[PDB]
Every structure is written in C-alpha cells, then in structure tokens.
C-alpha cells in the first residue's frame, strides 16, 4: 500500500506498540497508552528515564525500501458457534433440463 499509505515527507499516522509487560494472547487487542515502566521507579503518568510512551510511528515514505513500505493486511477468522451459520459461499447453479 505504498501508493496509499505513503506520502512525500513520511506518513506517521500509522503506529505500533513498542513496549509491553507481556506478550499478547491470540486475538487480544491492547490500545492502552499507559507509560511503560521499564525500571523499578513508578512513572505516575510521567515520561522520563525508564518511562517511555508505549507507541511509535511508522516512517512510510514513497522512497522507502519494500521492507519498510506500508502493507495493508486483512485477517479473516471463521467463527463457528452453536448458532446458525449465516455466512455461506455462492453455491453456483446449472441450467435446468
């Protein structure tokens, strides 16, 4: 998505979490902006030494390496529950004889 999610000067609208106390669980979403306590000293919502903002921008420029260029990703997960299956395929017809 270099054509869409990059611009001259660098697109910084896209962020990523750089720090976290633990790994995420499957399909866990963490959107917290709590100041990451890297050390033993509580941050009390104050950044500084061993007190970092957990998020950081992507440097998306049109001139960026393919590795560093933006890529749009959609993950499709198929929920199966004890409830009617409502998402089905097209099931194509044939002519009648």
């Amino acid at each position, epitope marked *: 998505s270099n054509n869409l999610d990059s611009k001259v*000067g660098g697109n910084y609208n896209y962020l990523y979490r750089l720090f976290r106390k633990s790994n995420l669980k499957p399909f866990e979403r963490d959107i917290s902006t709590e100041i990451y306590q890297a050390g033993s000293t509580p941050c009390n*919502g*104050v*950044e500084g030494f061993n*007190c970092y*903002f957990p998020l*950081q921008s992507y440097g998306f420029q049109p001139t960026n390496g393919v590795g560093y260029q933006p890529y749009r990703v959609v993950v499709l997960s198929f929920e199966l529950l004890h409830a009617p299956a409502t998402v089905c395929g097209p099931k194509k017809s044939t002519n009648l004889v």
Partner: nanobody
Amino acid sequence: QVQLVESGGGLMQAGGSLRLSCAVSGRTFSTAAMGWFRQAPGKEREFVAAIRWSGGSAYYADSVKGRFTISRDKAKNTVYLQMNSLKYEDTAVYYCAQTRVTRSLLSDYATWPYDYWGQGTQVTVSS
C-alpha cells in the same frame, strides 16, 4: 500544515525571568510533540526543551535543566517556556517547533528533525 508564532521575548537582567509563548494554527490535531530551540549570533542552533502533546512529559537539555519549564495548553493550542535564572549563555533567538511524529523515547525529540518552525523571538540578558 501548521504555522507557529512566538512571543514574549525581549530584554531582562541575569538572574531574572521571561515567559515565551508559541501559538499553533492549522492542522493542530496532528501535533505529536513541541520543542524550543535557540541560536546565539554566529553559533549553531541548539535544542532547549521538548514536550509530548499527550501526557505533557518534558525533556530538557543539560544547560537549562532546573532553570526552564516547558508546558502546554491543549485547549488553547499553545506551548510555553518559563525561563528563570537567566544567564549569559541564554542570549539568543528562540524558535518553537512542531512534529507530527510519535517517538517512544522522549529524548529522541532533542535530535529528531521537527516539521515546522516559527520565525523566532529574540532574548537578551543584561550585564
């Protein structure tokens, strides 16, 4: 696009105080961090202080630390520099600056190229 307008510079005696303001206008929802820089005549530009827009946390260069307070008003879209115990070295043109860039390490803002600059306001410290 944003435009930055400094104000509150001028003459003051060494050991006294001054308050610089900088008003942000344009696409202000895009401000990630703000900074103050200074440049005496004939010497290179120098980082003074930075503030993260969300959180309000401040990073200062060693030369001003404990003398200067950076602060922000999200509502009024303005960054302040409270200069106390003014000295010889403080004399310079002061520039405010804006970046749309989120850096995890607040210290990054000392060295990181900002996106927009004010025209500047002159500070002069009497003998």
